[PDB]
């Protein structure tokens, strides 16, 4: 309806990005810094200056980065590894403050909630880490029988959503109950892995989820009532969803056939734009701090930066 460029503003190169659906290899900091996991290194790229930094490189043969996530203030970076560590990195100092172990298998997903960092694993378990204290491992949430590939705290901290290659979506309370750590909800309707998980920024209890190749749907939920408010065939595995306040839209990333981004109007779920370019499947979307730009990372070893939510 308005002008949404059909091409990316910038195309960063992402050589040796690992073409593995379950990983979460890109994140955009409040400080305008893109973190990007390419095989066994993480690169930082300022969208302000254009400066590039190789933050770290794994030490051991065969080890690679399996997830990254910035802390809110953008000065520390969490990094999950194929060797089941959650490392914590001070980005200015360029030092590694912690190397937290607890998981039995690779750590593919990460989400922050203040000083609690939540980590998910190929084992199916989710761990809460109090990164301030010595015994970092303060909770275990066990609601998945296979890889936790989607993990996101609600903006208001009241809920944590997790998505799995067991095709489950769980919504966790922020604090255990009498039963201990048990989901408030468990949605079984997806028929494929659910890596795409995102909270509506302007509707507290509303969650969007997206399914893998055998599912292909985007689903919207009320996590209070348990209702599916909407299911849309996206015709392609859905790797990531973001919400945009700017125009009240969602954007999702896809693979085969067209490897496109699709922008949808909420709550009508009408298709606004398709953003073509990527020549292989999209792996991840992440959003800039001003909300104007989405970064897509794909298996064609590029990051495209789309100015698709510009204001006035």
């Amino acid at each position: 309806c308005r002008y949404i460029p059909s091409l990316p503003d910038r195309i960063l190169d992402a050589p040796e990005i690992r073409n593995d659906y379950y990983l979460n290899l890109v994140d955009w900091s409040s400080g305008n810094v893109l973190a990007v996991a390419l095989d066994n290194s993480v690169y930082l790229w300022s969208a302000s200056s254009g400066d590039i930094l190789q933050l770290l490189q794994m030490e051991q043969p065969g080890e690679y980065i399996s997830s990254v996530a910035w802390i809110k203030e953008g000065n520390y970076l969490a990094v999950g590894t194929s060797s089941a560590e959650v490392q914590l990195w001070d980005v200015q100092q360029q030092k590694r403050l912690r190397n937290m172990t607890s998981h039995s298998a690779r750590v593919g997903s990460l989400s922050w909630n203040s000083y609690i960092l939540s980590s998910g694993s190929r084992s199916g378990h989710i761990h809460h880490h109090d990164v301030r204290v010595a015994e970092h491992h303060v909770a275990t949430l066990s609601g998945h029988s296979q890889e936790v590939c989607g993990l996101r705290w609600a903006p208001d901290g009241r809920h944590l959503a997790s998505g799995g290659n067991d095709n489950l979506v769980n919504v966790w309370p922020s604090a255990p109950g009498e039963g201990g750590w048990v989901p408030l909800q468990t949605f079984t309707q997806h028929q494929g892995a659910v890596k795409a998980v995102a909270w509506c920024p302007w509707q507290s209890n509303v969650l969007a989820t997206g399914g893998g190749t055998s599912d292909r749907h985007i689903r919207i939920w009320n996590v209070c009532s348990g209702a599916c408010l909407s299911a849309v065939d996206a015709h392609s595995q859905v790797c990531s969803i973001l919400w945009s306040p700017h125009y009240k839209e969602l954007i999702s990333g896809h693979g085969f056939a067209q490897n496109q981004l699709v922008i949808w109007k909420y709550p009508t779920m009408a298709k606004v734009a398709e953003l073509k370019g990527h020549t292989s499947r999209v792996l991840s979307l992440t959003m800039s701090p001003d909300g104007a730009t989405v970064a897509s990372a794909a298996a064609d070893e590029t990051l495209r930066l789309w100015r698709c939510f510009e204001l006035d």
Partner: peptide, 7 residues
Amino acid sequence: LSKENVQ
């Protein structure tokens, strides 16, 4: 499973 990494 590598279900979502299969061709």
